[PDB]
Paper text:
Many processes driven by actin, such as cell division, depend on its ATPase activity. Here we present 6 cryo-electron microscopy (cryo-EM) structures of rabbit skeletal α-actin filaments at approximately 2.2 Å resolution in 3 functional states, polymerized in the presence of Mg2+ or Ca2+. After the exit of Pi, ADP-bound F-actin represents the ‘aged’ state of the filament, which can then be depolymerized back to G-actin. By contrast, our structures are remarkably similar in all solved nucleotide states, showing that ADP-F-actin should not be regarded as destabilized but rather as a ‘primed state’, which exhibits faster depolymerization rates at the filament ends and is sensitive to cofilin binding and severing due to the absence of the γ-phosphate moiety.
The unprecedentedly high resolutions of the F-actin reconstructions allowed for the modelling of hundreds of solvent molecules and we accordingly observed clear densities for the nucleotide and the associated Mg2+ ion with its coordinating water molecules. The overall conformations of all Mg2+-F-actin structures are highly similar, with a Cα atom root-mean square deviation of <0.6 Å and no changes in helical rise and twist, indicating that the differences are in the details (see below). In the Mg2+-ADP-Pi state, the cleaved Pi moiety is separated from ADP by at least 2.9 Å, indicating that ADP and Pi do not form a covalent bond. After ATP hydrolysis, Q137 in the nucleotide-binding pocket moves upward by about 0.4 Å in the ADP-Pi state so that it resides within 3.1 Å of Pi. This upward movement of Q137 triggers a sequence of small movements in the SD1; the proline-rich loop (residues 108–112) moves slightly forward and triggers the relocation of the E107–R116 salt bridge, which allows the penultimate residue C374 to flip into a hydrophobic pocket, permitting R116 to interact with the carboxylate group of the C-terminal residue F375. Altogether, these changes result in a compact, folded C-terminal helix, which then unfolds again when Q137 moves downward after Pi release. In Mg2+-ADP-Pi F-actin, the C terminus forms a compact, folded α-helix and the D-loop is predominantly closed, whereas the Mg2+-ADP-F-actin structure resembles the extended C terminus and closed D-loop conformation of the Mg2+-ADP-BeF3− state. Our structures show that BeF3− and Pi make hydrogen-bonding interactions with S14 of SD1; and the backbones of G158 and V159 of the SD3. Thus, the γ-phosphate moiety forms a bridge between the two subdomains, which is absent in the ADP state. However, the S14–G74 hydrogen bond is intact and the back door is closed in our 2.2 Å structures of both the ADP-Pi and ADP states of Mg2+-F-actin and Ca2+-F-actin.
Residue numbers in the entry:
A (entry chain A), B (entry chain C), C (entry chain E), D (entry chain D), E (entry chain B): 6 to 45, 49 to 375
C-alpha cells in the first residue's frame, strides 16, 4: 500500500492510498524553545506538540510559498509524519508527494534525494497539486483553482491534457491573508506580533472571516451598524470584537493591492488562464471551475467567484463553480485515488532507476 | 451490395449502392494531441471525434487538392469509414471510389493497392467525380462544374462521350476560400490561426457567405450602410460581425487574383471548356450546365454563373444552370446509381485481374 | 412493286416506283465515335442519325465521285435504307439502282453481287442517272447535264438513242464546291476543318451561294459596297458574314481552274458534247438542255448556262435550258417512271439469270 | 539594305538582308505586372526582358496560330524589334515580312497599314514562310513542311511554281505540343499552370523530347525499364524526372487525336498534299521533302517522317527528307536571300503605290 | 523635412527623414503610480521616465502584437515623442508611420484620424515595416523577416512587387520570449512577477540569450558542465546565474510549441512564404533573406536560419541570410530613405484629401 503525503505550506496531510481521508493532519511547524530552562525538555517540537507549547517556542514554517526553505526542519517533519503520526516504516511503502506547479527544479530534486537516501522508500512520485484536485472531483476536464497556505495556482485541464502555458501561479494565499489580518487588527488596538500570536490570528481568520458578495456595499453596511461585528475569546480570556476586518481580509484574494501586490485577483487570474486556452475548450472550462484548498473555504467565496467570472466572460457562457464541502482535502483525496489506480503502478520512480540516473530522474518522469 | 465511398478533400461520403443518401458523412481529418497528458487517451482521432476534441489536437487533412499526400493517415480514414461508420467487412463488398480528373497516376495506383492488399476488397473501381454528378442528374449530356474542398473541375460530356481534351481543372476550391476568409477576417481584428480555428472559419463561411450578383455594386452597398452585416457567435461566446467579407470570400471563385492566382474564374473556365468542344455540341452544353459539390452551395452562385456565361456566350444561346438542392452529394448519389447498374457489373476491377497485372490495371479499366 | 434507290455521292433517294417523290432522303454518311465513352451507344451511325450526333463522330462518305470506295459502309447504308427508312423486305421487291456513266466496271458488278447475295432481291437493274433525268422531263431528245455531289456528266440523247462517244464526265461537283468554300472562308477568319464542320459549310452553300450572271462585274460590285453580304448563324450562335464567297464558290463550275483543275467549265463541256454529235441533231440538242441534280439548284445557274452557251453556239440557234423546280429529284423521279413502265418488265436482271452468268451479267443487260 | 523580320507565333527573327543569321532572336511575348508595386517599373515588358521577369508578369503572345490577335501588343513587339534589337530607323529600310498560307486577308492588310503608317517604311513585302524555306535550301522544287509555334503547313513547289490547291495547313504546332506536355506532366504530379510555368515546360520540351521511330515499341521499352527517364532541374532547384512523356509529346504531330484533333498527322498531310499534285511531278516531290521550323528540330523526326512516308508512297519511289541543321532559321535565311536578289527589287510594295490603292495593294502584289 | 516615427510594440524610433539613425529611441510604455503619495508627482510617466521610476509604477504597453489597444495611452506616447523627444511642432512636418501587415483596418484608420485631428500634421503616410527594411538594405528583391517586440512577419518582394498572398504573420516576437524567459527562470528559483520585473527580464534576455546552432547538442553540453552558465547582477545587487535558459528562450522562435503555439518556427514560415511565390522568383528569394528588428539580434540566429532553410530548400539553391549590424533600426532607416525620395512626394496623404474622404483615405493610398 502506498503513502500519500500532501506537504502544504501550512498543514501536513498524510495517510494511506485507498482511504478517503488523511489519517494525520497536523501543522507543518517546527518550534524551538526561546527561553531559559530552569527545571531539571526536547530541543525542538514538531506539529501539534509545537502548537500546544507555542507560548515558549519560536515557530518556524519550513515551507514558504510552496518552496522548502529549511531542509533540516523539513526532514524533522517527514520523520515525525512517518514514525509518529502514521507509524510506518517508509522503506516498504511507495510515497506519493505533491508540489505546486512552477516550483524551482531543485525543490523536487531534493525531495527525491531525501526520500531515497534518508527514508529509503522503495518508490516515490511527485504530483502537481491541482491535478490531484481534479481526480478528487471525478473529472477529466476543468480549470482547478487550488489555494492553500503558500500558493494559489490555476491549472486548466481538458480531457486529461494540461495546458502548461496557461498555468498561473500567485504567491498569495492563506499565510499572506493571516499577515494582512494581523496588520489590520492593529486598527482596533489588538497587537499580535510573535509567531505564537500569528497562530491565534490564523484561528480568528478561519472562524470569523468571510467573502463579501459586494465589497463596497458591505463596507457601507459595516459602517452604518454593528450587525457584522463578532466577538472572539483569546486563549487568556480576553475578548476581541472585529467588524469589517472579517471581509477585508479575504478581499485581498480579489484585490491583491491591499497587500501591495501588482497582480490581479483570483477571478481575473482564472479568466486570464481560460483565455490563454484554445477557443474550442473555453466553454467546458467555464462550466468546470474546481476550487480546492483551505483558502477556498471562506463562506461566500464560490458565490463571489461565480459573480466575478460571469462579469468577465461572455453572457452566453454558463459559469459553474464546483466547490465541494471536502475541498480542503481534495489534493490528498485525489492523490489517494491516483496512487490506487492500476494504471499508475508503472509511473512510480523506483529506487533502481534512481540509482542509474540520480535525483534528476524526477524531471523526466513527473509533470 | 457495393460500397460507394466519395473521398473528398474535405468530407468523406460513404454508403451503400442503391441508397439515395450517404450513410456516413464526416470530416476527412486526422487529429493528434499537441499538449501534455496528465491524467491516467488515444494516439490519434479521426473524423467527427477529431472535430469534437479539436481544441487539444492538431488537425491534418490527408487529401490536399484531390491528391492523397499522407497515405498512413488516409488509411486511418478508410479504416474508420469501413469499421466504425458503415460497420461492414470490406472483404465482401465491391468498393466504388472517386477521383478528380488530371490527378497523378500514382494516386489511383496506390488506392488500388491499398483496397486490395490492406482491406482485401473483392473488386473496386475508381470513377471520375464529375461523371458521377451527371448520373445523379439523370443526364447523358452536359458540362459538369464540380467544386469541393480541393478541386474545381469542368468535364463536358455529350451523349455519354467525354471530351478529355476539354477537361479543365483548377486547384482552387473550398479550402482556399476558407484560407482567404481567414486572411480578410484580420481586417476586422479577428485572428484565427490554428487548425482548430480554421474549422471555425469554415463554419462561418458555410453560414454567412454568399455570391453577389454584381460585385462592385455590392461593395458600394456594404460601404454605405450595415444592411449586409451579420453576426456569428464563436464557440466561447464571443460575437463577431462581418460585412463585405460575406461576398468577398466567394468572389474569389470568379476572380482568382484575390488569392494571387493567374487563372480565370469558374465562369470563364466553363466557357473555355465549352469553346474547346466541337461547334455542333456547344448549344447542348450551354443548356446543361450542371453544378455539384459543396462549393457550389453558396446562395446566388447559379444566378451569378448564369449572368457571367450569358455575357460570354452568343446572345442567341440559351444558358441554363442546373443546380439541384441535393448537389452537395451529387458525386455520391451518382456513384450509388452507377454501382447499382446491371451494365456496370462487368466494369469492376476484380481481385483476380489485379493479381495478374498489379496496381497498373487501374489505368486501363478506369477513365 | 419496285424499289427505286438513287445512291448519290451525297444523298440517298429511295422510294417506290409509281410514287412522285422519294420516300426516304437522308445523307449518305457513316459516322463513328471518335471520343471516349464514359457513361454506361452504337458502334456506327447512318444517315440522319449520324448528322444529329456529328459533334462526336467522324463522318465518312462511302461514295466518292460516283464510285463506291468503302463497301462495308455502303452495305450499312443500303441496310439502313431498306429496313429502317423504307421498312421493306428487299427479297420481294425488284430494285432499280442508278450510276454515273464511265464508272469502273467493278462498281456495278459489286452492286449486283451485293443485291443478289446480301439482300437477295428478286431482280435488279442499274440505270444511268442522266438517262433517268430525261424520263423525268418527259422527253426523248436532249442533252442532260446532271451534277450531284460527286460527278457532273453530260449525256446527249436523240430520239431515245444515246451517243456514248459524246458522253462527258467531270469529277467536279457539290463536294468539291464545299471544299472550295471551306478554303475561301479562311480569308475571313472562319476555320472549318472537321468532317462535322464540312456539313455546316455545305449548309451555308445551299442557302447563300448563287451564280453570278457576269462574274467580273459581280466582283466589282461586291468590292464597292456591302449589298451582297449576308449573315448566317452557326449551330453555336456565332454569326458569320460572307460577301463575294457567295458567288465565287459556284463560279468554280464555270472556271474549274479555281480548284486547280485543267478541265473546262460545265458550259464548255456541254458545248463540246453537242459538237461531238452529228450535225443534224445539234439543233434539237441546243433547244433541250436538261439540268438535274442538286448542284444545278443554285439561283441563276440556268441564266448563266443560257448566256454561256449562247456565246459558244451559232447566233441562229435557239438555246433553251430546261431547269424544272423539282430537278433535285429528277433521277429518282425518272427511275420511278422507268420502273413502272410495262415495256421495262423484260429488262430486269433476275436472280435466275444471275446464277447462270455471275455478276458480269450486268454488263450485257444494262447500259 | 532591307530588313527581314520573321514574326513567328513563338519567336521574332529579325536581321538584315545579306546576312546569314538573324541578328535579333527573342520571344514574341508581352508581359504585364500582375502584382502590387510597393517600392518607389514599366507598364509592360517585351521579349527577353519579359522572360527574365516572368515570375511577376502575366505573359501574352500577340500571335496565335499564325494570326495576329492583339494588334496593340504586336506593335509593341515591332517597335521593340526596330528600335531596341536592331537599332535602326524603319523609315529608311524596306521590310520583308513573313506569313503562313491560308491566313485571313485582314491579317496582312493590317500588317501593311501598320508598316506604312506607324513605322513609315519606304517599301514592304509579305512572303509565304514555306516559300522562303525553299530559297534557304537552294532549291526550286520540293514540298516544304514548315512547323513553328503556331502553324504546320505544306507547300508543294515545282520549278518555282506553287500548287496552291495542294497547300495544307494544320493549326497544330509547337504551342499545342507545349500545352499537351503540360497536361501529361500532371500524371507524375508536376503542376505547371501559370503563363510563366508554360515557358518552363517549353524549355523541358526543347531539351528532353524526341520522336520515337516506332511509338508502340518505345512505349513498351519505357514501361519495362528506366533507360529512357531523364531529369531536369527547375528554376527553383526542384528536379523532375520524365520517361515516356519525352516521346509522347512529339507523337502528337503524327497522331493529332492525342489532343482531340480529327486531322491527320504531318506524314499523312505531306502525302495528301503530294497526291493532290499532278502525277508527273510527284516523283520530284517525294525526293525533296524540306523540313523547316523549330517543331522539326526534335531528334528523330526526319527518320520518322522518312519511315512514315515510305510506307504511304509506292515502293519504287525514293523518299528523301531534307532536314538541314540550320532549319530553325530557314524562313529568315530564305527571306534574307530573297530580299537580296536583284530580281526582287521590282517586287516591293512602295509607299507610293500604297497611297493610291490602300492596304488592299498587298493582295495583288504578294502571294 | 519629414518625421519618421516607427512605433513598435516595444520601442519608439523617431527622427527626421534624411538622417541615418533615429534621434529618439525610448520604450513605448506608460507608467502610473500604484502606491500612496505622502510628500507634498505626475499622474503618468512616458518612455524613459517611466523606466527610471518603474519601482513605484505599473507599466502598460499601449501596443500589443502590433495593434494599438489603448488609444489614450498611445496619444500620450506620440505627444511625448513630438514635443519632448524631437521637440518639433507636428503641424509643419509630414509624418511617416509604420505598421505590420495584416493588421486590423481600424488601426491605421485611427492613426490617420489622430495625426490629422489631434496633431494636425500637414500630411502623413503609413508604410509596411518589412518594405522599409528592404529600402534600408538597398534592395528591390528579397524576403524580409522582420521580428520586433510584437510581430514576426515575412514579406517576399521581387523587383519592387510584393506578393501579398505570400505574406506571413506570426504573433510571436520579443515580448513573448520575455514572458517565456520569466516562466523558465522560476526553475532556478528566480521570481519576476511585476511589470517592472518584466523589464529586468527583458534586459537579461538582451545580454545573455543566444541561438544554439544545434539545440539538442547544446542541451547536452549545458547538462554536462557549466561552461555556458553566466551571471547577471540585478538592480539590488543580487546575482543570478542562468545556464540553458540562455538558448532555450530564443529556441521558441524555431519551436513555438514551447509556449503552446501550434504554428511553425520562423525558418519554416520563411520557407512556406517562399514556396507560395512563383517558381521563377524563388531562387532570388533564397539568396536575399533580409532579417530586421530587435528579435533578430540574438547571437547565432543568422547561422541558425541559414542552416534551417538550407535543410528545407533544394541542395542546389544558394541560401544567403542578410543580417546587417544595424538591422535593429532597419525599419526606421528605410523609412528615412523612403521619406526622402523625390518619387515619394506624391504619395503623401495630405490634409486636403483627408477632409474630402475621411480616415478611410488611408486604405486606398497606403499598402
Ligand atoms: N474555514 C477556513 N476559512 C478560511 N481559511 C481557512 C479555513 N480553513 C483553513 N484555512 C486556511 O487554509 C490554509 C491552508 O490550508 P490547506 O489547504 O491545508 O493548505 P496547505 O496545503 O498549504 O497546508 C491555511 O492558511 C488556513 O488558514
Ligand atoms: N452551404 C455552404 N456554403 C458554402 N460552402 C459550403 C457549404 N457547404 C459546404 N461547403 C464547402 O464545400 C467544401 C467541400 O464540400 P464537398 O462537396 O463535400 O467537397 P469534398 O468532396 O471535397 O469533401 C467545403 O470546403 C465546405 O466549406
Ligand atoms: N439549293 C442548293 N444550292 C446549291 N447546292 C445544293 C442545293 N441543294 C443541294 N445542293 C448540293 O447538291 C449536292 C448533291 O445533291 P444531289 O443531286 O442529291 O446529288 P447526289 O445524287 O450526289 O446525292 C450536294 O453537294 C449539295 O450540297
Ligand atoms: N530543339 C527543339 N526541339 C523541339 N522543339 C523546339 C526546339 N527548338 C524550338 N522548338 C519549338 O519550335 C517552336 C517555334 O520555333 P520557330 O521555328 O521559331 O517558330 P515560330 O516561327 O513560330 O517562332 C517553339 O514552340 C519551340 O518550342
Ligand atoms: N541584443 C538583443 N538580443 C535579443 N533581443 C533583443 C536585443 N535587442 C533588442 N531585443 C528585443 O527586440 C524587441 C523589440 O525591438 P525592436 O526591433 O525595436 O521592435 P519594436 O519595433 O517592436 O519596438 C524587444 O522585445 C527586445 O527585447
Ligand atoms: Mg496545499
Ligand atoms: Mg468532392
Ligand atoms: Mg446524283
Ligand atoms: Mg515560323
Ligand atoms: Mg518593429
Amino acid at each position: 500500500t502506498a503513502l500519500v503525503c500532501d506537504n502544504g505550506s501550512g498543514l501536513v496531510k498524510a495517510g494511506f492510498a485507498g482511504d478517503d481521508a488523511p489519517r494525520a493532519v497536523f501543522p507543518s511547524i517546527v518550534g524551538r524553545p526561546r527561553h531559559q530552562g530552569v527545571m531539571v525538555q526536547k530541543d525542538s517540537y514538531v506539529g501539534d506538540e509545537a502548537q500546544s507549547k507555542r507560548g515558549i517556542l519560536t515557530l518556524k514554517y519550513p515551507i514558504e510559498h510552496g518552496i522548502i526553505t529549511n531542509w533540516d526542519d523539513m526532514e524533522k517533519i517527514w520523520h515525525h509524519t512517518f514514525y509518529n503520526e502514521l507509524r510506518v516504516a517508509p522503506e516498504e511503502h511507495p510515497t506519493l508527494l505533491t508540489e505546486a506547479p512552477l516550483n524551482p527544479k531543485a525543490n523536487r530534486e531534493k525531495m527525491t534525494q531525501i526520500m531515497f537516501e534518508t527514508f529509503n522508500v522503495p518508490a516515490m512520485y511527485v504530483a502537481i497539486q491541482a491535478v490531484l484536485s481534479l481526480y478528487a472531483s471525478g473529472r477529466t476536464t476543468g480549470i482547478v483553482l487550488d489555494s492553500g497556505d503558500g500558493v494559489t495556482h490555476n491549472v486548466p485541464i481538458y480531457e486529461g491534457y494540461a495546458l502548461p502555458h496557461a498555468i498561473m501561479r500567485l504567491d498569495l494565499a492563506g499565510r499572506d491573508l493571516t499577515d494582512y489580518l494581523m496588520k489590520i487588527l492593529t486598527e482596533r488596538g489588538y497587537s499580535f506580533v510573535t509567531t505564537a500570536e500569528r497562530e491565534i490570528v490564523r484561528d480568528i481568520k478561519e472562524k470569523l472571516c468571510y467573502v463579501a458578495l459586494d465589497f463596497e456595499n458591505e463596507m457601507a453596511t459595516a459602517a452604518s451598524s454593528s450587525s457584522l461585528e463578532k466577538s472572539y475569546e483569546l486563549p487568556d480570556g480576553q475578548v476581541i470584537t472585529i467588524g469589517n476586518e472579517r471581509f477585508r481580509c479575504p478581499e485581498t484574494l480579489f484585490q491583491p493591492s491591499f497587500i501591495g501586490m501588482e497582480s490581479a485577483g483570483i477571478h481575473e487570474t482564472t479568466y486570464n488562464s481560460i483565455m490563454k486556452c484554445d477557443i474550442d475548450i473555453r466553454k467546458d472550462l467555464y462550466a468546470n471551475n474546481v476550487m480546492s484548498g483551505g483558502t477556498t473555504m471562506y463562506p461566500g467565496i464560490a458565490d463571489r467567484m461565480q459573480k466575478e467570472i460571469t462579469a468577465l466572460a461572455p453572457s452566453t457562457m454558463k459559469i459553474k463553480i464546483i466547490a465541494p464541502p471536502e475541498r480542503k482535502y481534495s489534493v490528498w483525496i485525489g492523490g489517494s485515488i491516483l496512487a490506487s489506480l492500476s494504471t499508475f503502478q508503472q509511473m512510480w520512480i523506483t529506487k533502481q532507476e534512481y540509482d542509474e540516473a540520480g535525483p534528476s530522474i524526477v524531471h523526466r518522469k513527473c509533470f
